[PDB]
Design a protein around this ligand. Structure first.
Ligand SMILES: Nc1ncnc2c1ncn2[C@@H]1O[C@H](CO)[C@@H](O)[C@H]1O
Ligand SMILES: Nc1ncnc2c1ncn2[C@@H]1O[C@H](CO)[C@@H](O)[C@H]1O
Lengths: 330, 330
């Protein structure tokens, strides 16, 4: 027995969500479908231009941990908030889902991170993130016992942006591997890959990271290639297991020379694509820590991803375990 | 030439919204479908038992002002928040909708009001409100010029719960009538009517309030009768205009001896009933200040109410002015 199936580690963020049109993105120099990093002043400026919004707990790794708990897995999370109302909200949501979350705030300032997410009529999301208290996440926030007791530890590529989070992750990898556990990462965003391509490859090649998540764009960007087949071949050579999502074209899971394709789920209405990749990882890692085939892990991933894009907010409000059972994923 | 069509005055609240079952309400002694007032400690207790939530600006009068702005009217709002993150969200949302909002916060404690709203599978909402900063709303928060320049000033029955808000409302009535404008109120909630029925009747009979909004239960409650026909006849005798909503049975508008019955719109499906009454008042008062017939004002209320119950959150995120056009009402 282990205490946890999946520990995740990431930027603790509250999402501020509003609808807009494509012209709004252009007028404001917001890169569509990307994670745009912003300072405190620009956050205020974008907020002043934004329509009425809804707030929902987010953060890539936070969403993933919540999705694992929703599916019936045992999940934990490390991530730093401030002692403020947004922090109280984040703390509440993730704990209310049954995730172990014990990272202690370090005061009220800087405040808890927010991402201004503009959702266009096609359901695509464009995020604009002020990292706030996330910049504080460091080695002191690693609960060594938790990493040791977790079957998989999963972290965001996004964590290379704040300064000391990488040191926490290197500690995680050491502890995880000392206990025969596995490490996993997501590439997060193509622009993040642009920033850290070489460091990400080295994490993979040195064996610090075992299982890598990417979408098509991130995989292309990792090798700065336009040839998807080459990207798949190279990613398979660089890590133990790769799981690559291809939007409305499903997913492919790679392990050495084996490839497992997962068919493209049909979506009646896309409300908001926020959290799709995060919930793919939830379904995959839940499957993986239950000992399911790689194909079934892929299927569980696409199931969760398909559900989250049919609602507002990045964490499914319906029962994923119920959906998985109806789907025969057991 | 007036500056505003509708000024509203109410408790400035952020909604904390979560799904639950009927049993949860029973277990927690929450009165289904009512506004339950709670202290700080009970708010924390209920929060600790609530599932993951979404936050959305609320407040009955706040929602009504937002709705009037959405339809294309010119709206203002008086309501008190704290200088905290929840207050910043409230301030942002109402201003982003184009509502004039200039009430000044009076420090960080008490904090901005929150309502824990539990939504059952039938879409009904049961609210649990900690008034926080709302207790500080008083005569000093009346912008005399705004009241003078508003066609209708509308306020919540809910304002009789905090101590000093009533003095502000009496000032509004004096100013509005001196300038030849009209006063309106909503009865808010059947238990609120239980608490203040004598005060409310005095407001109506003294002519401090011209137009009264109520649902069926509130109207029955005002006269402590089971006889709805008697409730309508009496309410017509006690105010200049009454608008009484009857849920799936629509509404009835009463002026002296005139009655106009109006149908509810056909609902796709009830998601969350929060704000239905507030948005009925938005549509009615929008129509009213545009000089529409009483029947057309009823029609606009039913449309607006009908839209809000088909989404999460109490303030329509789609265009009410658009929907009014497509339904041939504008
Ligand atoms: N810099 C970031 N680091 C981690 N997660 C982020 C970042 N920016 C946005 N997100 C999260 O991505 C999630 C969807 O993938 C959103 O809920 C949002 O909170
Ligand atoms: N005491 C109160 N006063 C005014 N509005 C309230 C109160 N409690 C809940 N509400 C609001 O009622 C709205 C729905 O009518 C919700 O959005 C909620 O914020």
């Amino acid at each position: 027995m282990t205490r946890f199936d999946v520990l995740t580690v990431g930027n603790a963020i509250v999402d501020i969500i509003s609808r807009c049109n494509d012209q709004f993105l252009i007028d404001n120099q917001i890169t569509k479908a990307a994670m745009n990093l912003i300072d405190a002043e620009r956050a205020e400026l974008l907020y002043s231009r934004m329509g009425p919004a809804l707030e929902a707990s987010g953060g890539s790794a936070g969403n993933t941990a919540a999705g694992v708990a929703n599916l019936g897995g045992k999940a934990a999370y490390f991530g730093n908030v401030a002692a403020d109302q947004l922090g109280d909200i984040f703390t509440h949501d993730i704990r209310a889902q049954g995730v172990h979350y014990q990272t202690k705030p370090k005061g009220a300032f800087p405040p808890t991170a927010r991402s201004m997410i503009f959702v266009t009529e096609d359901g695509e999301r464009s995020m604009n993130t002020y990292l706030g208290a996330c910049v504080e996440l460091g080695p002191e926030d690693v609960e060594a016992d938790v990493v040791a007791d977790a079957k998989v530890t999963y972290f965001e590529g996004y964590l290379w942006d704040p300064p000391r989070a990488k040191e926490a992750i290197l500690d995680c990898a050491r502890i995880a591997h000392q206990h025969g556990r596995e490490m996993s990462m997501t590439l997060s965003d193509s622009f993040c890959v642009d920033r850290y391509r070489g460091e990400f490859l080295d994490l993979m090649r040195s064996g610090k990271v075992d299982i890598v998540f990417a979408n098509r764009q991130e995989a292309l960007s990792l090798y700065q290639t336009d040839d998807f087949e080459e990207a798949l071949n190279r990613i398979a050579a660089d890590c133990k297991i790769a799981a690559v999502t291809m939007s409305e074209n499903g997913a492919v899971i790679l392990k050495g020379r084996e490839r497992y394709y997962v068919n493209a789920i049909r979506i009646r209405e896309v409300v908001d694509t926020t959290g799709a990749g995060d919930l793919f990882a939830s379904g995959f890692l839940y499957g993986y820590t239950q000992g399911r085939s790689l194909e079934d892990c892929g299927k569980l991933g696409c199931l969760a991803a398909g559900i989250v894009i049919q609602q507002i907010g990045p964490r499914p409000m319906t029962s994923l375990s119920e959906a998985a059972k109806q789907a025969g994923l057991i």
